[PDB]
Design a protein around this ligand. Structure first.
Ligand code: SF4
Ligand code: SF4
Ligand code: FES
Ligand code: FES
Ligand SMILES: [Fe+2]
Ligand SMILES: [Fe+2]
Lengths: 635, 635
């Protein structure tokens, strides 16, 4: 088998060969067994929203042409897309809500493993929300912030403040004029599910406007999640670590944290240190915590925990034979891990009540008992390490160097070394003079349909040569880090001369004797909100709205409903937004035309659907350069 | 074409012949064009929850056997079912929330077309919720009730009170022990959408427990909707009217109200009276308001507005040529009505922001302007009547007599004429002595897969002969009313001797010189909550939980996600619950076993999946008789 057709990651290729000779079925094998996939679902021309279905519509030819109730292709496609947006927003809702409850418990004395670690961020958030801080105790300010977070989930006398206070007034005004500001996060999710049920909304434009509004509920959940996690766990600052499977160590207890909400896995990191001597008593060198997916990104950004792998290739960490435990919260966890565990000697542990996997051990995490829970979990991992005494393992000796931790605060701080009282100005100066052509945010997942990482790296390489400042989150950051795009030693090879000059100037003013890395890692999927903060700050500093800035986004290998929601809010806030896999819209030309063209007249953003990555890079560069021209800049 | 294979309603058959010769496509034609339907969707073995899909699993044979991410058939089936429950609950959320806002506006002086019409119900609801009434103005009590309603949508220091205050403490205790009490209505909807997204919950039992809890969020929305509509519009009492297409009048302006939330259509009824002389100036005899679907049931129950048709046959009202306007809110409206309108000369009008139909005129209803909006709408209808001057119409001269209005308060009042201070006792006496074998609630829709009404009438006939007290809501009530089951003149033919004796005794004590009708119409789909109130009151009076009572439910021709949610909460509160169409569960035996068998050990209720109505009636009778035996009663 030509494993490079499955993944461009050489460590993944090595583990695919091991899985093949050991007869362990992988995600790629399950994909092959699924082909050919249903074309009605692929194009969006299937509806199961009532028990008269399934209804399907032929993309072309003869009947069926319309759903049983009369729903047109337009309506079916838009309703399906809307439910995907609501599902994505629901995951942001759950993640942010859990942190809000954790912060409230911490300051009420109910969860002493948690605390206010970033008091400055707490006060800034409170100020942004309009909560008084002068003369108030930090615990009372934090209680008010947590109450405000919980209030944004339902209707009240204000709209969702984690939208209206984080975008510039001119953008809020555009959105309000179109009725797009969410009334409440869970309120919008429920309204989507209602309006898309049988015999309700049946006008494509009306449906899609509802979807844009629900996507902003996802944005609010993202921003709230980042805000609360920074209060609780610290705002990221620049870190150096490593990525890929070679970060596993045969002689250590290897523990992966996997999922998205790091609420317990930030605790796992701290407790794992305490238990070093206990792990050594078991014959290990220590506990080696490694990251998978967003939870991995969270602890990478804040603590420099090395990232083992991401998204589509997550099973491969287990195939090494050296993964003693995989500690799960929720989201993006292939449930195959529970069955593979029996073959590989990994202990798979679930921790959240609403995310269990048949066959995996469940340990009831509670903030109130977080240290206790962590010790129970890590002792299972130590037990598992002991059971593999004397078993060879196959860890690919493949890893990259990763500089990360570029929160928006960290980026502004780095720029302030060039201009202390106007830190965005050096960035803008270099956009104006062409040393920085524009900004591209890579976001979202890998997808088994695309050879792993191929779109991210192909597009990033062409943008970097054209002097684009590239920022990344989620498993887009994962793809780029595992291929060396976060190692400053690769700036000469990857970057155009103008971009190299800027990364070098900033790095040398931050005492590095060397440049910033080719790509700036801005964190997890909720931390796409950090990219919003940066872009909104640039818009404010320039006095223009986001749809005039040379800033684009690319969900180059999108998979999860979360990625559909993110792409939709990127469009809603004003960005040209590439998606590199086909969303289920091509069965309706009118819906496609709205999402790729006429939405420009509503929000200024628009989708760019392009599966060929070289072509996508050209289209993204054209979008950037069109924005440059609109600002009167050379390009 | 043998139209009796499509509908057992003879008026519908006549209009199907008219549609055929005029070349107007109907729901039945669109169904035929859809056959054969996809077996993966039919069985539940399809997933589109991420962009790696669609994934499908062969019910039997070879690969594919598992989803791409590892999701098993169990997981796929349970996730799909859970999303359907959440969608149903979301419609109850929207409906109830709109009424809560209407009540709040009314008592704040912001919507003078609305008012407190049932002060006694207001005070009783307040007492049930724990809101003080002594010394308080009605407007302040109502503000507190509306605030409490809105609070049940989100988490707070109490669970959802429209669950915990409406079921007996022993039932609440059972549900709480299993973690099934909702934390908030929209909170549960969002948690379902999260947990069912890719890489989250992947254990069938855990998923289905979440679904049971979300179904109780639907129950809360139903009960809240009924409570608030009774405050605003009056609690139903016994009414006499008519049903079927013969209620249309060629010489009148015929206006159908269609959808579910009657917030404007209760106003349409009152304003239509005011405009009699204006309609007469246009050459009509008056404005003839008629009902379709739940909104029709609402105005039938409160005002005796005749019901034109229901559910699957709704297009046939238009085919007569005499329907001048169809006034829509949301839910259960086939969007085909907008295109048929061009053929039939009907003006189709949408009124709610989140439910538009391409090609239909939209009129922006606002409580604040309700009378103004109603006049605008009715003037469009008058204009349309004038355009059909001199056009023949074909109204089938087919109608039945309907006695309805059996709210739980009305039933208790009727029984109190036999026992003033213990009004449930005469009902219980007759259950004990066998004159009443048990109670069956018919609920939910028609479904194009089932010859219209055939399951409702076949099952009802066999239960009535076996002395079952039959109550009905929604388009189950619609089916039964259109076939004479709400006409007391049919008691001799339909009812067993014991049931006849009871209906006669109650009727003769209420001054009727004649029995109650064979079936008691308890209202719209949210008014399934009234059946809960009756059953909970019987449980309380007997000192037993609902899972010991000889009470069953039947969604005999279910269609909408709403009907899936209702069936699931019927099971959750303890009832044997028949469903007469196949829900998408048969692709997983473990899920089927949970829903039809092992849930008995959790809630005491269970699904009975049976597509053959004679067999379903036997299974429902066996369920009733098993409950009788458990109470020590003869059967
Ligand atoms: S909502 Fe309409 S299109 Fe969808 S399954 Fe039901 S009948 Fe078919
Ligand atoms: S969630 Fe799993 S089963 Fe569903 S479409 Fe995605 S890969 Fe397939
Ligand atoms: S027909 Fe294949 S996704 Fe429904
Ligand atoms: S394969 Fe037909 S419903 Fe998906
Ligand atoms: Fe992610
Ligand atoms: Fe209904």
């Amino acid at each position: 088998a030509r494993q490079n057709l499955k993944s461009t990651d050489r460590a993944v290729q090595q583990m695919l060969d091991k899985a093949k000779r050991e007869g362990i079925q992988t995600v790629w094998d399950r994909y092959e067994a699924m082909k050919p996939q249903c074309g009605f679902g692929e194009t969006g021309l299937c509806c199961r929203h009532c028990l008269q279905g399934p209804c399907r519509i032929n993309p072309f030819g003869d009947e069926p042409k319309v759903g049983i109730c009369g729903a047109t292709a337009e309506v079916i496609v838009a309703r399906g897309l809307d439910r995907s947006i609501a599902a994505g927003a629901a995951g942001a809702s759950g993640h942010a809500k859990h942190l809000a409850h954790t912060l409230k418990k911490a300051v009420q004395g109910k969860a002493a493993s948690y605390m206010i670690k970033d008091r400055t961020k707490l006060h800034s958030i409170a100020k942004r929300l309009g909560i008084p801080t002068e003369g108030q105790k930090d615990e009372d300010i934090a209680l008010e912030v947590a109450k405000a977070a919980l209030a944004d989930f339902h209707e009240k006398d204000t709209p969702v403040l984690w939208v209206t206070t984080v975008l510039p007034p001119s953008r809020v005004k555009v959105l309000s004029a179109h009725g797009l500001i969410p009334a409440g996060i869970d309120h919008e999710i429920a309204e989507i599910m209602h309006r898309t049920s049988m015999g309700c909304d049946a006008d494509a434009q009306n449906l899609l406007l509802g979807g844009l509004r629900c996507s902003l509920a996802d944005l609010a959940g993202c921003y709230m999640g980042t805000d609360l996690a920074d209060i609780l766990f610290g705002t990221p600052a620049p870190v150096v670590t490593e990525s890929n499977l070679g970060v596993l160590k045969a002689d250590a207890v290897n523990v992966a944290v996997h999922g998205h909400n790091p609420v317990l896995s930030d605790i796992i990191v701290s407790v794992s240190k305490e238990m070093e001597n206990e792990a050594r008593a078991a014959g290990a060198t220590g506990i080696n915590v490694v990251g998978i997916c967003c939870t991995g990104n969270e602890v990478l950004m804040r603590h420099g925990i090395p990232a083992c792998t991401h998204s589509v290739s997550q099973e491969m960490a287990m195939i090494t034979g050296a993964l003693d435990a995989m500690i799960l919260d929720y989201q993006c966890i292939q449930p195959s891990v529970a069955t593979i565990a029996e073959c590989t000697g990994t202990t798979v542990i679930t921790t959240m009540e609403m995310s269990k996997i048949t066959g995996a051990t469940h340990v009831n995490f509670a903030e109130e008992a977080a240290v206790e829970n962590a010790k129970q979990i890590l002792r299972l991992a130590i037990d598992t390490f002991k059971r593999r005494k004397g078993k060879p393992v196959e860890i690919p000796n493949i890893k990259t160097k990763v500089v990360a931790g570029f929160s928006t605060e960290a980026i502004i701080n780095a720029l302030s070394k060039l201009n202390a009282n106007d830190p965005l100005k050096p960035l803008i100066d270099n956009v104006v003079n062409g040393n920085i052509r524009g900004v591209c945010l890579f976001a979202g997942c890998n997808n088994v349909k695309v050879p792993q990482d191929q779109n991210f790296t192909t597009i990033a390489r062409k943008l970097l040569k054209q002097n684009v400042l590239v920022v990344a989150t989620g498993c887009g950051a994962g793809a780029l880090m595992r291929h060396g795009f976060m190692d400053p030693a690769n700036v000469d090879e990857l970057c155009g001369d103008g971009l190299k000059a800027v990364l070098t100037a900033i790095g040398e003013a931050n005492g590095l004797g060397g440049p910033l890395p080719p790509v700036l890692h801005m964190g997890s999927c909720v931390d796409n909100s950090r990219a919003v903060a940066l872009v909104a700050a640039l818009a404010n500093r320039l006095g223009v709205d986001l749809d005039r800035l040379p800033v684009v986004a690319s969900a180059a290998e999108a998979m999860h409903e979360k990625a559909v929601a993110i792409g939709t809010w990127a469009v809603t806030i004003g960005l040209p937004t590439h998606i590199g896999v086909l969303p289920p819209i091509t069965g309706s030309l009118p819906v496609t035309q709205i999402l790729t063209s006429s939405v420009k007249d509503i929000t200024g953003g628009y989708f760019i659907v392009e599966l060929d990555p070289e072509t996508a890079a050209d289209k993204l560069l054209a979008a950037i350069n069109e924005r440059r021209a609109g600002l009167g800049l050379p390009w």
